[PDB]
Design a binder for this molecule. Sequence first.
Ligand SMILES: CCCCCCCCCCCCCCCCCC(=O)OC[C@H](COP(=O)([O-])OCC(O)COP(=O)([O-])OC[C@@H](COC(=O)CCCCCCCCCCCCCCCCC)OC(=O)CCCCCCCCCCCCCCCCC)OC(=O)CCCCCCCCCCCCCCCCC
Ligand SMILES: CCCCCCCCCCCCCCCCCC(=O)OC[C@H](COP(=O)([O-])OCC(O)COP(=O)([O-])OC[C@@H](COC(=O)CCCCCCCCCCCCCCCCC)OC(=O)CCCCCCCCCCCCCCCCC)OC(=O)CCCCCCCCCCCCCCCCC
Ligand SMILES: CCCCCCCCCCCCCCCCCC(=O)OC[C@H](COP(=O)([O-])OCC[N+](C)(C)C)OC(=O)CCCCCCCCCCCCCCCCC
Ligand SMILES: CCCCCCCCCCCCCCCCCC(=O)OC[C@H](COP(=O)([O-])OCC[N+](C)(C)C)OC(=O)CCCCCCCCCCCCCCCCC
Ligand SMILES: CCCCCCCCCCCCCCCCCC(=O)OC[C@H](COP(=O)([O-])OCC[N+](C)(C)C)OC(=O)CCCCCCCCCCCCCCCCC
Ligand SMILES: CCCCCCCCCCCCCCCCCC(=O)OC[C@H](COP(=O)([O-])OCC[N+](C)(C)C)OC(=O)CCCCCCCCCCCCCCCCC
Ligand SMILES: CCCCCCCCCCCCCCCC(=O)OC[C@H](COP(=O)(O)O)OC(=O)CCCCCCCCCCCCCCC
Lengths: 26, 63, 713, 54, 72, 505, 51, 96
Amino acid sequence: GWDRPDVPLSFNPLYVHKRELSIFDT
Amino acid sequence: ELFLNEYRKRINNEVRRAAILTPTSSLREKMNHKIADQILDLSSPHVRGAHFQAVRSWTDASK
Amino acid sequence: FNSILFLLFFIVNLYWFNSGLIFFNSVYKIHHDAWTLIFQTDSILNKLKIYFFLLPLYISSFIHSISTWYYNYILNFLLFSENLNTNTNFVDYITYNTLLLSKFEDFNLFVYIKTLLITFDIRQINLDFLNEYPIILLTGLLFLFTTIFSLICLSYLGLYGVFILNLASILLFWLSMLYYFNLIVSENYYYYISLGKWMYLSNGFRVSFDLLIDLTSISFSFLTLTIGVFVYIYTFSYFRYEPLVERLILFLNSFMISMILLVSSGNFIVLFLGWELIGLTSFFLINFWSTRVGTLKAAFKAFSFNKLSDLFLFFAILIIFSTTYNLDILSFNNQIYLYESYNIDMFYWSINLIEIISFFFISCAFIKSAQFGAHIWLPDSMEAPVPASALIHSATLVSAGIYLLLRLSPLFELSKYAYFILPLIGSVTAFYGGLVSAFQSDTKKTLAYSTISHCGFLMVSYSTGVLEFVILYLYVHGFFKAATFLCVGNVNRFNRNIQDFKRMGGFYKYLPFECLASFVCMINLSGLPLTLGFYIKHLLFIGLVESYTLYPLIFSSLILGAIAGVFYSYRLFYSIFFDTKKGKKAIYLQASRIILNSKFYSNTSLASNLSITFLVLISYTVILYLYCTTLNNYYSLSDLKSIYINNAYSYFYKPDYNFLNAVSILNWFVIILLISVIYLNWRWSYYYTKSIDSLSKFILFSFFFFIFSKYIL
Amino acid sequence: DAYYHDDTHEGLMNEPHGYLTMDDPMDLRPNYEKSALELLFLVSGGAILALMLG
Amino acid sequence: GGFQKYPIPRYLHVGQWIVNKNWKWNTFHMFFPTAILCFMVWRNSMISTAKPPNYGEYVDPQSPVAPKAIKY
Amino acid sequence: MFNLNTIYLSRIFIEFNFYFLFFLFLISSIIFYFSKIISIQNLNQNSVFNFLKLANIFGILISFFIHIISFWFYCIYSYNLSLNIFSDINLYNSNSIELLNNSLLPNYFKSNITIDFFGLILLTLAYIVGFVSILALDTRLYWKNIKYIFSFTIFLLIVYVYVTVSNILLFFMCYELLLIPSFLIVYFVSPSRRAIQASLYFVIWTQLGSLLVLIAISYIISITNTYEFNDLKYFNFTNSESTIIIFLIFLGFGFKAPIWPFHYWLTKTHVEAPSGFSIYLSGFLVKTALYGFYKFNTSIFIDIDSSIFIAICIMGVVDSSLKMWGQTDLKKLVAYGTIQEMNIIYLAFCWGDSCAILGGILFSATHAFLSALMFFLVDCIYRRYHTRSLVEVNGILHITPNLGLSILFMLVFFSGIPGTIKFISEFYIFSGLLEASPFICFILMLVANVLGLIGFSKSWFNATFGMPKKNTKYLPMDLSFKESYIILYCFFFLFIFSYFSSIFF
Amino acid sequence: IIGVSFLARRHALKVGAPRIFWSGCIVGVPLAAIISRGKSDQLDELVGARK
Amino acid sequence: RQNFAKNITTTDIPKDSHHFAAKRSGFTQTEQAPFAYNDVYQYPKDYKPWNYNYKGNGVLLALFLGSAFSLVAYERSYASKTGRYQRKVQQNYYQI
Ligand SMILES: CCCCCCCCCCCCCCCCCC(=O)OC[C@H](COP(=O)([O-])OCC(O)COP(=O)([O-])OC[C@@H](COC(=O)CCCCCCCCCCCCCCCCC)OC(=O)CCCCCCCCCCCCCCCCC)OC(=O)CCCCCCCCCCCCCCCCC
Ligand SMILES: CCCCCCCCCCCCCCCCCC(=O)OC[C@H](COP(=O)([O-])OCC(O)COP(=O)([O-])OC[C@@H](COC(=O)CCCCCCCCCCCCCCCCC)OC(=O)CCCCCCCCCCCCCCCCC)OC(=O)CCCCCCCCCCCCCCCCC
Ligand SMILES: CCCCCCCCCCCCCCCCCC(=O)OC[C@H](COP(=O)([O-])OCC[N+](C)(C)C)OC(=O)CCCCCCCCCCCCCCCCC
Ligand SMILES: CCCCCCCCCCCCCCCCCC(=O)OC[C@H](COP(=O)([O-])OCC[N+](C)(C)C)OC(=O)CCCCCCCCCCCCCCCCC
Ligand SMILES: CCCCCCCCCCCCCCCCCC(=O)OC[C@H](COP(=O)([O-])OCC[N+](C)(C)C)OC(=O)CCCCCCCCCCCCCCCCC
Ligand SMILES: CCCCCCCCCCCCCCCCCC(=O)OC[C@H](COP(=O)([O-])OCC[N+](C)(C)C)OC(=O)CCCCCCCCCCCCCCCCC
Ligand SMILES: CCCCCCCCCCCCCCCC(=O)OC[C@H](COP(=O)(O)O)OC(=O)CCCCCCCCCCCCCCC
């Protein structure tokens, strides 16, 4: 019924790094 | 060495032929003959199937 | 320059040439060597008459001579070889060959044209020719090439193009497989085909690419192909309106062909190839949702286990090759008994050769069949779409170990390790899977754990050692597991990808076909009295051996696993369909709108319903055929190529009072469990007192009915 | 289904599209890397056919 | 049932919701040539196919077809 | 039916292909030097750089075709020579056929050419890998390093003399000549700044082994004044001399062909070297050492236990396989894979001249092609996605489907599926090792094909799959025709070389 | 096979359909003949008539 | 960067000069000057970017001729191995 807006880019949310990627967790 | 390996390959092919031609009944009875003895006699010590080296003394190489 | 005139002249020339050919043939027969005396007579009038009346023959011979001269020149030019037989000059050669007419001695134009026409005649093909030469290869190659080329050319073949092409190929393959299934299973027909010398594997060795279509191969091949046909028909509806339906369809076809190649393998190299191919294609199917990395973790888990199994299988094959300088399956099966007495000198222990080879084979078989310990990947493999899950868990991925055991049975018959390990692990897996499935709440997880339990039962059946019982169990489990998987897939699609039935309730009306189809499929799958699936468990308990040291644990685990079927079947069916409505209001309201009321109304696909119905019908027919072949008084199964007789059929033909009364214990255990799952109340209801009253009525009526039936008549 | 949209009317059904490779269809460079690799493939195949097969 | 359709870039050669108008002729010209190739492969392989004797046939042990042991 | 025409055609083709390459190189170099006062590119469409690129590419390619023909002639010649020697049993008859040299071109370095199957396999690897690497280095050569367009032609000439000579000293000199061009390429063509230190590490690590091999050659030459490589049959080295020679030879050639612990230089150089030169290094430059080790150890009689050398090779395999998991850098991961494969190949040569050499040669060929494929894929990833790290690269398949498909098929080939020369080589080596020492064979197979394989596959699968939501304005398009056909040719060779005549394998 | 493949390949080109499969048929007819003739000529005794 | 010449003489570049039009009247005192070159690339109709768009028979003919040459060469080779000027076809051929 309703004309839905095109699928949101929000469906895939960009992930922003906030913590160091330790080399001990490679 | 390749010729002995060829003997082993030929006897294996003959065993496959026997398996296909002869039903499982009497198959072992007919195999317990020249064929089985040759299969055992062509074992690894006598034929170098896939081993890196066939450990042969100079007398064995001459033979 | 008229087409009609050209055609008329051509027809006249044809008739004239045919008449001249007949005349020359007759004259040549009369004058075998003296025909020249009249043909090449020095008389000018006779020479002119002969040339005029045989002009079509003479012009044809001239054209043939020119063509032969040019062809010989081309061959000499290309091959730097010899001359045109001799060094005849062009003029001498052409004159001699044109004057020579003996080339037409046995040639008749009408006969030649008729032979060319009848060459392609299809009336000639006969069953006897098909029986001599298997057309299974022609259709399997068709299916394989169709899948490969469809994968490559996706843009050319849209959704509909891919579907129709692969549907045609798979239907032809299945029909041919169906035709040869009757001959292979009962008529003692099996084929050994070779495509060529594949690779060199030693200084002078070269293994050929060979296929073995035997009873052992066909049992798995026909089951996988029959399940795959309907899974293929069903997938186009399950993945309806999805971005990537062609990819899923082609992945399913790839996995099917990989499993078919594995089962119908003529030597260990082809077997290993098929092993790796099923592993890789199962990985792709599990990782179908490539965008998500959560799916990649399950795919990588399955990949690691598959690589471990590949290591074990490769090492076992290497041991076999080192012992016997041969990789042929038949040769190995018929030779292993000679080398049974041998031992292998390892690091610090002298291990028995049969024991070590069987150890590696059983390890890889357990990993791929999801036995206890190595089953951790199977629950996580449910991330795949339901068609892929059904195909892998019914008869394609989880039966690879069973196929290995059946194909190399002569090896394991002389294996102490196999004797000790197969029953114990099989029973433990059966119990574990059954109980976990009973306590499970998700549909796909429940089916996965039920698959684990049935694989354990298959291992225990092989331990008993009746290959016919193992094959029957495999067929029953595969067919009904696949059907139940399809039904739960429809249920999940309706419920919007929520696979837990805690949010499912009152779906009987919204999915009428699924409810009844699931009822039938589940009663058959879970071994229940008066169903096609009761006999498999009955035969397993008939054949179970009693000389084991851990027999107490084995038998108790088997009993618990066998009874566990009832709980999971009841929970799944009741909670999905006839329980109180637990799902979100939207699921029901979106479909209850009056505007939708129509002759076309349905929450599933008509093609899906037809596919499930045909799958159930064909499974019933095939299971009945196998039961008649094996369990009938007249044994008409084809040779299994095994010399180990277990004596288990004695308790199926002439059971004694002890065993007859022993089976009653399990029968009544199942009866009590059914009564519990039916009449037991866990929640307050308006019908609590009336439910207790109904239980009392049923008990008393059962007693009186038994009294009248046995004594009063 | 209830409200299925036909392909002829669905504006988001895609016909075959996209560029097979990164090479520009209309390129003015006399580039020969593709020709060199095609020649390598063809000569290898021809050598197999004319020297090795059979 | 399925996910909502979203635009796909034209430049990208991907299979998302790809439908071909000429799929009928494409299928016709992809099926029959494949069938001919498989027929050629099948007739080539049939030369190296093995089958056990029929119902009324027995293998004579002294016939050439019968298996023969290696003669040293 | 074999005739002298085939013999002379084989010899003439082998001799004249070298002079074809040399004359092409000489003409190209003369043009380059005498066309410009300063030998650098003129940044215009009419530069001589285009002509030099054309000449190098289609000299290598045409010489590769001629090498195919000459290799086939050699195969026929060697097979029929063995038949001629073996067939005749009469005591009066003996095969003594003497060939007279042509009067057109001279014998380079006054040496009679001798060709073997391993040498020609090495030469074919040189041709193909050099072609791939030159195709890769086009974007790297610009306006001051154009002089390095001839590096692969120089490599081809050096390798040709290396594999078509029966002289020990010329053999050693050809082996040692490879250092300068490779060092210059790494030093002047590598974009990364760490390449400066990587080049020094490469030079020092390889030169230590070169000095070891030099000491061994000095021992052989000083003791035996001969140089014909066949007079060693009539001279026997004492036990001490033989053990010293084998130790020096093994260690020196293992410095080049990476062995544990001498692979630090290899990792550094592969990480910091041009993506186009890493292909050539891994594919070919580590196998000249294997060829030299094979020649020397099969010529010398050694009466020592090879357990220590086998242990070194197995330790290298285990070390590389265990470290595969912890690499997020695709290039370093491929370098560890190269170390593993090279150590397996080297292990294949630890039983003198036994049948293990066949598996070693086949594994050398398959590793060359597989490493070329892997490094080329890494090159494509790095060039279109401006990073070769797993953390920065994800979801390649969804933006570049062809590249993701190439990665997946590369992993499948690396896994060693049947129908591939990789599988055939693994089968040879493991079949021998099972009888040699079954428990060691089990440990090696387990580690390499499970733990190392899983570590290798983790990073590649993580890169291929996922969802590339980052930097949507800078995403690349796809593989080009050049890259696609290179990948296809690598796959085609890996698949079809299994049909090569089994006489030599 | 060759004639029908040529005609069908022409039709596929006309209607814009794939034709590399018809090309494969045409190319492989001689190759299939070579393989079959070589297999027949080889003195290899599979299960069947002895040489 | 690239230094090749765009304007080739082997053929005339396909183009459309009507898609973009340059303004030539009615300007304002704040509007930028128009552009001189406004031709766009025009592809041939029926060009499909998703395949090779190859319509030649050269490759097929080359492969078929190579296969035919290989067949005839093998025939001659077999005759030479058997020591005959031509193959001696037998009356019956069996499986093998
Ligand atoms: C984009 C690519 C990206 C690559 C990089 C990424 C790589 C990794 C990821 C891979 C996955 C992603 C890429 C895949 C998607 C690509 C999408 C795409 O581009 O779509 C367009 C692409 C091209 O079609 P199109 O663009 O519409 O039109 C192209 C032209 O119109 C066609 O013009 P034409 O009609 O004139 O045809 C020209 C010619 C095609 O010309 C060539 O390709 C030149 C080949 C030179 C030789 C090189 C070695 C070949 C080795 C065998 C493989 C043959 C090639 C087939 C492809 C590989 C296998 C799948 O066609 C033929 O004649 C075919 C015959 C070839 C046989 C040659 C054999 C040489 C000797 C080999 C060794 C000895 C064999 C003994 C056998 C004995 C008997 C069994 O889509 C396809 O059509 C796919 C075709 C796939 C192959 C099947 C068809 C050929 C079958 C040949 C015979 C074998 C079958 C059984 C025969 C049985 C009897 C013997
Ligand atoms: C698990 C991994 C899986 C990976 C794979 C996944 C699947 C991937 C699928 C996608 C990729 C593969 C399939 C698609 C490939 C592309 C097909 C295509 O159509 O592309 C269009 C592509 C692009 O089209 P284009 O831009 O127009 O370029 C056209 C070409 O430049 C040239 O076109 P053209 O029209 O100018 O034709 C040129 C032709 C010119 O053709 C001709 O000249 C033939 C006609 C004349 C015959 C002679 C007549 C003489 C007397 C005169 C008679 C009157 C005139 C007659 C002619 C009139 C004009 C027709 O010249 C040649 O071909 C030279 C070859 C010569 C050496 C070999 C053949 C001879 C052998 C010895 C023969 C001895 C007997 C004869 C003796 C003769 C007397 C000495 O063109 C081609 O097809 C070129 C061929 C090479 C294409 C690439 C092939 C890649 C193959 C990859 C295989 C990978 C295998 C991996 C296996 C992995 C297994 C595990
Ligand atoms: C002691 C005598 C010798 C035999 C030893 C063994 C004793 C019997 C052991 C029975 C264990 C059965 C475990 C079933 C677990 C089911 C879990 C599940 O799915 O959820 C619950 C499902 C119901 O699922 P539901 O979804 O409807 O609701 C679940 C509600 N909650 C979660 C709140 C519990 O089924 C049941 O509730 C029935 C199981 C409980 C009743 C068990 C009665 C046992 C009667 C034994 C009779 C023995 C006859 C004599 C001979 C025996 C030996 C031959
Ligand atoms: C001579 C005899 C016959 C010769 C034929 C030789 C065939 C050799 C093998 C060819 C493989 C072709 C693969 C094409 C893949 C195309 C891309 C695709 O599918 O989508 C990728 C999908 C999505 O692709 P996409 O939609 O982004 O892009 C498609 C279009 N392109 C690629 C051009 C841009 O990505 C993936 O997730 C990777 C999936 C890979 C799945 C590969 C499965 C292969 C299964 C084969 C089974 C064969 C059984 C053999 C049994 C007998 C063995 C002896
Ligand atoms: C004492 C004797 C000394 C001999 C010294 C040899 C001198 C060599 C001088 C080379 C000059 C190169 C430029 C010539 C002018 C090109 C004009 C042009 O582009 O128009 C197109 C015309 C014709 O083009 P076309 O369109 O007709 O294409 C067909 C090409 N042919 C004729 C070759 C079949 O000229 C050419 O295409 C010639 C290309 C020459 C460059 C070739 C590069 C490949 C490697 C060989 C280089 C030479 C080294 C020696 C041979 C190899 C070793 C044996
Ligand atoms: C691994 C170390 C780090 C990497 C750098 C590599 C350096 C070491 C390279 C290998 C050198 C050889 C070691 C094994 C020697 C085996 C034979 C042996 O000595 O046994 C006693 C041998 C063998 O004796 P035998 O008992 O077997 O038989 C002879 C017995 N008699 C004599 C009693 C009849 O006895 C000797 O004759 C003594 C020889 C000693 C030689 C030691 C010096 C070698 C100098 C040349 C190489 C120098 C390379 C330096 C490189 C740069 C270093 C920074
Ligand atoms: C019971 C099986 C049910 C399923 C069958 C599915 C179809 C299988 C394919 C058809 C049978 C093929 C094998 C024939 C065996 C044979 O030679 O059988 C023998 C007969 C002749 O009899 P004889 O050889 O005994 O004299 O063969 C023929 O008559 C050949 C005529 C052609 C047969 C069909 C060929 C199909 C291949 C594709 C053709 C494409 C044509 C062009 C399209 C544009």
